[PDB]
């Protein structure tokens, strides 16, 4: 797997409860099936002296989400997005498009309902067998 090389940028996912629907940013540290990653945004300590490292499943990893027609495109009610929240990307569904150009996003998993600015949203992508979508 080309992207899984030590030093490579990856988005990390969890099967763990409370982390349903999130991609956090990170890099590979070692590959042996499980491998070791270092989060970019999470730390062991509240003081940020020690980047969080974990052993996860390759199933759980993926390349950095693909990157100007893409970002200028409008967001619609019903579009699947990731919202940047708690320092990672969480998938929810756009429930409302607001007058000031903000958006209300429903998170099916946590029953949360949160408003965001466009700069806080990216289009949701899926990574399937080496391909995006």
């Amino acid at each position: 797997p080309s992207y899984l090389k030590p030093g490579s940028a990856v988005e990390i996912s969890s099967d763990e409860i409370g982390f349903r629907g999130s991609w956090y940013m990170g890099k590979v540290i070692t590959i042996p099936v499980k491998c070791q990653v270092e989060y970019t945004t999470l730390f062991f300590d509240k003081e940020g002296t020690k980047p969080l490292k974990e052993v996860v499943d390759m199933s759980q990893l993926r390349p950095p989400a693909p990157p100007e027609i893409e970002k200028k495109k409008k967001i619609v009610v019903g579009e699947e997005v990731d919202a940047f929240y708690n320092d990672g990307w969480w998938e929810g569904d756009v429930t409302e498009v607001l007058d000031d150009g903000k958006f209300s996003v429903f998170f099916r998993s946590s029953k949360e309902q949160i408003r965001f600015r466009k700069d806080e949203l990216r289009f949701h992508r899926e990574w399937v067998d080496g391909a995006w979508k």
Partner: peptide, 10 residues
């Protein structure tokens, strides 16, 4: 300064 404890939703 985000931690797993203050990042988890559950």
């Amino acid at each position: 300064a985000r931690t797993k404890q203050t990042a988890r939703k559950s």
